[PDB]
Design a protein around this nucleic acid. Structure first.
Ligand SMILES: [Mg+2]
Ligand SMILES: [Mg+2]
Ligand SMILES: [Mg+2]
Ligand SMILES: [Mg+2]
Ligand SMILES: [Mg+2]
Ligand SMILES: [Mg+2]
Ligand SMILES: [Mg+2]
Ligand SMILES: [Mg+2]
Ligand SMILES: [Mg+2]
Ligand SMILES: [Mg+2]
Ligand SMILES: [Mg+2]
Ligand SMILES: [Mg+2]
Ligand SMILES: [Mg+2]
Ligand SMILES: [Mg+2]
Ligand SMILES: [Mg+2]
Ligand SMILES: [Mg+2]
Ligand SMILES: [Mg+2]
Ligand SMILES: [Mg+2]
Ligand SMILES: [Mg+2]
Ligand SMILES: [Mg+2]
Ligand SMILES: [Mg+2]
Ligand SMILES: [Mg+2]
Ligand SMILES: [Mg+2]
Ligand SMILES: [Mg+2]
Ligand SMILES: [Mg+2]
Ligand SMILES: [Mg+2]
Ligand SMILES: [Mg+2]
Ligand SMILES: [Mg+2]
Ligand SMILES: [Mg+2]
Ligand SMILES: [Mg+2]
Ligand SMILES: [Mg+2]
Ligand SMILES: [Mg+2]
Ligand SMILES: [Mg+2]
Ligand SMILES: [Mg+2]
Ligand SMILES: [Mg+2]
Ligand SMILES: [Mg+2]
Ligand SMILES: [Mg+2]
Ligand SMILES: [Mg+2]
Ligand SMILES: [Mg+2]
Ligand SMILES: [Mg+2]
Ligand SMILES: [Mg+2]
Ligand SMILES: [Mg+2]
Ligand SMILES: [Mg+2]
Ligand SMILES: [Mg+2]
Ligand SMILES: [Mg+2]
Ligand SMILES: [Mg+2]
Ligand SMILES: [Mg+2]
Ligand SMILES: [Mg+2]
Ligand SMILES: [Mg+2]
Ligand SMILES: [Mg+2]
Ligand SMILES: [Mg+2]
Ligand SMILES: [Mg+2]
Ligand SMILES: [Mg+2]
Ligand SMILES: [Mg+2]
Ligand SMILES: [Mg+2]
Ligand SMILES: [Mg+2]
Ligand SMILES: [Mg+2]
Ligand SMILES: [Mg+2]
Ligand SMILES: [Mg+2]
Ligand SMILES: [Mg+2]
Ligand SMILES: [Mg+2]
Ligand SMILES: [Mg+2]
Ligand SMILES: [Mg+2]
Ligand SMILES: [Mg+2]
Ligand SMILES: [Mg+2]
Ligand SMILES: [Mg+2]
Ligand SMILES: [Mg+2]
Ligand SMILES: [Mg+2]
Ligand SMILES: [Mg+2]
Ligand SMILES: [Mg+2]
Ligand SMILES: [Mg+2]
Ligand SMILES: [Mg+2]
Ligand SMILES: [Mg+2]
Ligand SMILES: [Mg+2]
Ligand SMILES: [Mg+2]
Ligand SMILES: [Mg+2]
Ligand SMILES: [Mg+2]
Ligand SMILES: [Mg+2]
Ligand SMILES: [Mg+2]
Ligand SMILES: [Mg+2]
Ligand SMILES: [Mg+2]
Ligand SMILES: [Mg+2]
Ligand SMILES: [Mg+2]
Ligand SMILES: [Mg+2]
Ligand SMILES: [Mg+2]
Ligand SMILES: [Mg+2]
Ligand SMILES: [Mg+2]
Ligand SMILES: [Mg+2]
Ligand SMILES: [Mg+2]
Ligand SMILES: [Mg+2]
Ligand SMILES: [Mg+2]
Ligand SMILES: [Mg+2]
Ligand SMILES: [Mg+2]
Ligand SMILES: [Mg+2]
Ligand SMILES: [Mg+2]
Ligand SMILES: [Mg+2]
Ligand SMILES: [Mg+2]
Ligand SMILES: [Mg+2]
Ligand SMILES: [Mg+2]
Ligand SMILES: [Mg+2]
Ligand SMILES: [Mg+2]
Ligand SMILES: [Mg+2]
Lengths: 86, 273
RNA sequence: UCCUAAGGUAGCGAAAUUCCUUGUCGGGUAAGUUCCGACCCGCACGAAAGGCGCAACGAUCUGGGCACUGUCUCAACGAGAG
RNA sequence: UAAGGAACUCGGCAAAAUGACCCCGUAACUUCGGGAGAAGGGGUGCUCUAUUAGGGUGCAAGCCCGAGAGAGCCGCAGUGAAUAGGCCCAGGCGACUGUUUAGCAAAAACACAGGUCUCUGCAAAACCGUAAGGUGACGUAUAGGGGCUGACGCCUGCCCGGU
RNA sequence: AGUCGGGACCUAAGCCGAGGCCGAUAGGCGUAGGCGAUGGACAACAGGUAGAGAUUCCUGUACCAGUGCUAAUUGUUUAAC
RNA sequence: UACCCAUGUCCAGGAUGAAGGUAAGGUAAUACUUACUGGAGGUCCGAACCCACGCACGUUGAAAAGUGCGGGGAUGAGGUGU
RNA sequence: CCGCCGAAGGUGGGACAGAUAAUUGGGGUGAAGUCGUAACAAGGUAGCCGUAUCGGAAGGUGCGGCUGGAUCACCUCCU
RNA sequence: GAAGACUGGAGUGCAGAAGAGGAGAGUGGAAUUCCACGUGUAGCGGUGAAAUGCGUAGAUAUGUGGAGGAACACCAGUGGCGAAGGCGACUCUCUGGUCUGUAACUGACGCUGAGGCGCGAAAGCGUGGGGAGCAAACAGGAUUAGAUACCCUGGUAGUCCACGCCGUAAACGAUGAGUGCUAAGUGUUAGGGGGUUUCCGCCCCUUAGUGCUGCAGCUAACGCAUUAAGCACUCCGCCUGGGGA
RNA sequence: GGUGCAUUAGCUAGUUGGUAGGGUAAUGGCCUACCAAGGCAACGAUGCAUAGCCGACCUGAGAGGGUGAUCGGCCACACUGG
């Protein structure tokens, strides 16, 4: 993920015009990364070292989603309908 | 790919076949079809000269372009089709003229590409060039032996030859069998490997499937009578009670070399397989 | 110790292969020269004349059961064609 | 055909027995598809509730299709006649479907899919023919001819003196 | 029997084959060309018929190809057809 | 009669339910599970048709190779006409 | 007298548990039997671990790994 | 348990850095082997000694050219990277993680983790290629009382590649993961700050790794010792005499 | 609340709930007709093995370990089933 491509996602999900570490922002960026590794892994089938990094993003992304659900349900259901998650 | 079949019956147990994923259309080009009639190995006189032939599904001839002498016209690949008469697939190419013709499908040839022949063609899969304009080391197929005649040397599915050197009027080629051969520099060739590589992995599975392709059963010589084969006779099963195993007409059959000893092309063969 | 090119490996073995032979022991039977399981002194097994196994299949060969019966103990009567 | 039920015989040869539809249930082993209609059992007729409950057809008249139940009735017997798998246990051979001696042998024999060795660079080798001319092939070593073995699983040992 | 099946229509396997190639003789092979249905194309139906034929004869109503005779129409070598 | 070539034609009924597809689940996405659909096979039972496994009869035969009762294949390496 | 339910009884295919059986496989015990000497020292070819193959037998050899190696030489760190 | 608040945990942002981390495509030079041709004559090779073997059909040696496969000399370092196995020629494409500085951002979002899912040296297995060196099995020559071995001459599977299995090791630091506290001395890898000085260089402080020596403490002893086997808390795995096994 | 085995992973169909009725001293699938497909289980269902339960008894520094004869309370049984 190139640096300017990341900064568009950050600017598109900020809850206010300054933050960069909101759970909404982090999940949106993390989603973009695992939707970019899935193509690399699909073609580079026997790249096992890179595939481990994929599974640490998925687990990390899942932890943040769980925290958002408990703290504020209304925000949580807004992200998943906007990012196309389950 | 290769498609394994579930062992529903005893004849489908070990059977595999292609899935025909590369084939694009199922209807041939009508104006390029000619009739074929089976011969079953029967001679000019009606005699059975080559045995184990005859009686399969009927086919129709598709006239192929092996010369590839339409130079300077960009030809666009239209479809990739099925040919019963050969192991490789074929590609239909319609030029900017309006003319259409079939060629052998190379490996990696897809619909939509453009194909060139001549002297200004680039070295890409599908192009046709004289062997003198082809750089050393490329993998070619469809080599012709006499200028203006047409491709003849490497043509079945998954086969390839490699350019190897120059000797003035001739070019060294390492043929698919592993032979190093000298060929004129004005003979043409096509760049790439031939299409259907998986063809050798197919397991026929049934005797009827061999019958569908035109193959009659093969009887061993050990179960014949002494007037039929040099191996027939004996009480019970019998070994090969001779000095060497023998063909149905004499002439030893295991290890005996049958190339003419006074051949005129022994000076063009650098090293044998 | 003698000879040879080298001296039979895994596996199987009274076998579609074992003469002696109905080999010997066990099972099945009231009683089993056939059958099944073991042993190995293989007259004269043995690795593409393939060796040892193997679900499904067989108007194939072999041994044993349930049901059923004029096959039999042991024959009797009736119909039709000669 | 009484009683017996393979005691007959080279051998259950021949005959007898099972047989339809619906429901319950079903083993070892397995290449996971099978084995399997395994095995072993139960129900079927007619009357009334009843142009049933419900479906097909039609605009309606109407016509056709017909499960479950309850109560009953009659026979020795209800797929009441004809037609309609006997099954199980263990071993040898062949993997299987197929082919064979018209007129004594249908098999363990032949074929087969698969394995391996070998020949062939294209006017290919191989084959028919004195030759021309052909098959191979309107093919091109992932192709074509010949020898042996014969699905699949685990394997395929030693000898190059002789030919 | 204009209409059914076959010729005067078409071709497959195969066969014959002017010149031609090959070969003691005889002849073998084969190009143009042609024969050759078991296949392709093609215009008619319903009744009557008491000794023997019926999509054939007879009755009623049709269709296909062609020809002549009449009546208008159009075109004539920048040229209908 | 054996094999081959060109061109036609024949195979009542019933049973089983391969690949694939859809939906609902299950996952980060897949794998995978369950229902519905689908209609494969030198598949299964069984007539026409083809064949010839057992027995009986016939044996100067109805017949110079058959008949009767059972039997095998019956969408295919199928039967058959010109 | 009839009907439902119903103990015992009969038939059938499976499940589980014990005993027994021609023969067979590895295991243990026995100071004195036969064969070799694989390990302990550099154990006379360093040893061991996983795996494959071979051999009367301990075992041999190949591939990768360990030091739970005294070893034989230049350099590097600590005292 | 519920409602709020915070930033020392955790994570994002911003500015730098290092690395044989991984997958794919292509290329390079030494060296071994084989092949062809000049020159040339009688040995070469091998061992503790030998012999088998190669050579007058002209070898070994030597000069020139061609074909092919495998591993990457110096750099190279108790140096580096990765969760472990492991990763060393060069270039490009696609990718994972870590360290340092800042204090912009969220505000406990954390640790461990039975079952589950993946990776996992070498040998081995299936299908298709490839095959230069090495080399189980195997053959011959020696050694020996014997020698199915060590030693010598050859040599097949294998070692290499693509895809799919297998799931083990002295897979070891014989030391589970997370967190905090507890003398110092000295090398080295990647960073940051300050003083001297024009730089260079020297010194001091500090973060994360990697080695050695040593106090308290621990230990049966050997020994460990801020990279604990010391002092503590949380979670997981495992043990209870030897053989049979 | 008080037992062993996971080398015992699925069990159940009057089973789970509802509607109407029957029956009982009394609530209740206790029983019946209809309707739906539920209920239990890794916090160990199901299955196999063993056993009457307790006050109490023996031992032990204690926490615990083993037992349940005599005395007292409750339960089940009365040759074996109905
Ligand atoms: Mg052949
Ligand atoms: Mg054959
Ligand atoms: Mg014969
Ligand atoms: Mg002869
Ligand atoms: Mg012979
Ligand atoms: Mg014979
Ligand atoms: Mg014989
Ligand atoms: Mg005997
Ligand atoms: Mg026998
Ligand atoms: Mg006996
Ligand atoms: Mg007998
Ligand atoms: Mg008998
Ligand atoms: Mg026996
Ligand atoms: Mg023998
Ligand atoms: Mg033999
Ligand atoms: Mg042999
Ligand atoms: Mg055989
Ligand atoms: Mg056998
Ligand atoms: Mg057998
Ligand atoms: Mg058959
Ligand atoms: Mg029998
Ligand atoms: Mg009479
Ligand atoms: Mg009479
Ligand atoms: Mg009687
Ligand atoms: Mg009687
Ligand atoms: Mg009886
Ligand atoms: Mg009997
Ligand atoms: Mg008798
Ligand atoms: Mg007898
Ligand atoms: Mg009979
Ligand atoms: Mg009604
Ligand atoms: Mg009847
Ligand atoms: Mg019947
Ligand atoms: Mg057979
Ligand atoms: Mg006969
Ligand atoms: Mg020729
Ligand atoms: Mg010729
Ligand atoms: Mg030809
Ligand atoms: Mg190949
Ligand atoms: Mg085989
Ligand atoms: Mg054979
Ligand atoms: Mg096999
Ligand atoms: Mg052999
Ligand atoms: Mg010889
Ligand atoms: Mg020789
Ligand atoms: Mg008329
Ligand atoms: Mg006519
Ligand atoms: Mg006509
Ligand atoms: Mg003439
Ligand atoms: Mg002619
Ligand atoms: Mg013609
Ligand atoms: Mg004609
Ligand atoms: Mg006709
Ligand atoms: Mg007509
Ligand atoms: Mg008449
Ligand atoms: Mg008429
Ligand atoms: Mg034909
Ligand atoms: Mg069939
Ligand atoms: Mg059948
Ligand atoms: Mg016949
Ligand atoms: Mg029949
Ligand atoms: Mg049938
Ligand atoms: Mg020793
Ligand atoms: Mg050895
Ligand atoms: Mg080693
Ligand atoms: Mg040691
Ligand atoms: Mg921080
Ligand atoms: Mg890298
Ligand atoms: Mg890499
Ligand atoms: Mg070089
Ligand atoms: Mg000496
Ligand atoms: Mg040289
Ligand atoms: Mg690390
Ligand atoms: Mg990256
Ligand atoms: Mg990187
Ligand atoms: Mg680091
Ligand atoms: Mg705040
Ligand atoms: Mg963790
Ligand atoms: Mg686990
Ligand atoms: Mg390996
Ligand atoms: Mg391999
Ligand atoms: Mg291979
Ligand atoms: Mg030796
Ligand atoms: Mg060597
Ligand atoms: Mg692999
Ligand atoms: Mg083990
Ligand atoms: Mg282990
Ligand atoms: Mg290691
Ligand atoms: Mg350990
Ligand atoms: Mg710790
Ligand atoms: Mg610590
Ligand atoms: Mg440090
Ligand atoms: Mg003990
Ligand atoms: Mg013990
Ligand atoms: Mg309780
Ligand atoms: Mg109530
Ligand atoms: Mg109840
Ligand atoms: Mg219980
Ligand atoms: Mg105590
Ligand atoms: Mg107490
Ligand atoms: Mg008492
Ligand atoms: Mg009593």
């Amino acid at each position: 993920l190139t640096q300017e491509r990341k900064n568009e996602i950050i600017a598109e999900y900020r809850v206010h015009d300054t933050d960069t570490g909101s759970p909404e922002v982090q999940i949106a960026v993390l989603t973009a990364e695992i939707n970019s590794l899935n193509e690399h892994v699909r073609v580079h089938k026997k790249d096992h070292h890179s595939y481990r990094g994929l599974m640490k993003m998925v687990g990390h992304r899942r932890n943040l989603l769980t925290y958002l659900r408990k703290k504020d349900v209304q925000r949580y259901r807004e992200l998943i309908k906007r990012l196309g998650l389950r | 790919a290769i498609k394994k079949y579930k062992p529903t019956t005893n004849g489908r147990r070990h059977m595999t076949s292609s899935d025909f994923a590369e084939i694009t259309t199922s209807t041939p080009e009508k104006s390029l079809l000619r009739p074929l009639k089976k011969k079953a190995g029967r001679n000019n006189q009606g005699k059975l000269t080559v045995r184990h032939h005859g009686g399969g599904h009927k086919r129709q001839y598709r006239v192929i372009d092996f010369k590839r002498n339409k130079d300077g016209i960009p030809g666009r690949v239209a479809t990739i089709e099925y040919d019963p008469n050969r192991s490789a697939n074929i590609a239909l190419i319609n030029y900017a003229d309006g003319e259409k013709r079939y060629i052998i499908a190379a490996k990696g040839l897809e619909v939509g590409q453009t194909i060139y022949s001549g002297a200004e063609a680039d070295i890409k899969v599908g192009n046709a060039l004289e062997l003198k304009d082809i750089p050393v080391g490329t993998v070619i197929h469809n080599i012709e032996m006499k200028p203006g005649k047409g491709g003849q040397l490497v043509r079945s599915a998954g086969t390839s030859a490699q350019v190897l050197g120059k000797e003035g009027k001739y070019v060294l080629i390492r043929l698919n069998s592993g032979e190093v051969r000298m060929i004129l520099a004005t003979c043409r060739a096509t760049i790439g490997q031939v299409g259907n590589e998986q063809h050798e992995l197919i397991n026929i599975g049934k005797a009827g499937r061999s019958r569908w392709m035109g193959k009659r059963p093969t009887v061993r010589g050990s179960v014949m009578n002494p007037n039929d084969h040099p191996h027939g006779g004996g009480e019970g099963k019998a070994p090969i009670g001779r000095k060497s195993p023998m063909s149905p007409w004499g002439k030893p059959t295991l290890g005996y070399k049958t190339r003419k000893k006074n051949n005129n092309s022994d000076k063009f063969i650098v090293r044998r397989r």
